[PDB]
Amino acid sequence: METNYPFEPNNPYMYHDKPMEEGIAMLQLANMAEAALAFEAVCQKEPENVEAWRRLGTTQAENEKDCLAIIALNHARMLDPKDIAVHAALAVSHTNEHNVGAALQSLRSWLLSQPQYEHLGLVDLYFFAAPSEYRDCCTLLYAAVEMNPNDPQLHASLGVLHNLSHRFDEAAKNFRRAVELRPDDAHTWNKLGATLANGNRPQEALEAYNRALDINPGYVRVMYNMAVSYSNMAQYPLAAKHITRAIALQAGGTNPQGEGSRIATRGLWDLLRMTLNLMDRSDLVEASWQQDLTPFLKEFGLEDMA
């Protein structure tokens, strides 16, 4: 139930002149690990900086660390409860962490914080695998779509909603509509991919994921999802290679020492270990326990760079 962000102690950005600009340059260079350290430094130096907390939060999600993402976005939300990108990110990370109620609440705050849509809050307004707020969210989002059908973000929010109710074929249509309206959005491509995989269409998901990687080559979360798709297809050696790549890039050689990274990296190593067991390669399992990348870089021909 942690509310304090566990800052990485190994952070050279704490003595950089311009960490915020560095972080944004690192995002532009597709380096999530470095961008997160830079935003962390900003959050330590300027704790009321809404943008630094928000960017730390979205960057950690992209770096496959939802737990840190949520803590960072929760700070951003405290400082500015109208920050709509904060609500959008929280709805996503909550959905991933199966916090269905928090995801519903974030979707509502996302819509109702928008001047375009806030009037919908004044409107006077089971057979679904969701709680009852889920029908309300449906009405609100469909009312918004009726007055503004070509807002891609309305479609993306329905996609999130339909994930929460395990309606993955519907979600996929939502995210398809969102990428049609905004095709350069790496996040939306990833969401379509995850939705297809969750709906047992890993071959289609891999297509979406390759689109997202084309846009953001450092999108560690997409690389994790690629491993998941291969794994669900029982293509264990390919999954093991992809997760190794995810791991390598998640660290980016920033060499983290903090408790935060300790727990957030473990789920990637867990997936590697399960893949190793399904490959009948128990001889590699102990290295997976010690989180030692070296034998995997060697094993999967990734010695050059991830």
Binding site: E64, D66, V92, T95, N96, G159, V160, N163, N190, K191, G193, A194, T195, A197, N198, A205, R221, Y224, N225, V228, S229, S231, N232, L271
Partner: peptide, 5 residues
């Protein structure tokens, strides 16, 4: 496994 949005 579950894929992440």
């Amino acid at each position: 496994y579950q894929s992440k949005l």
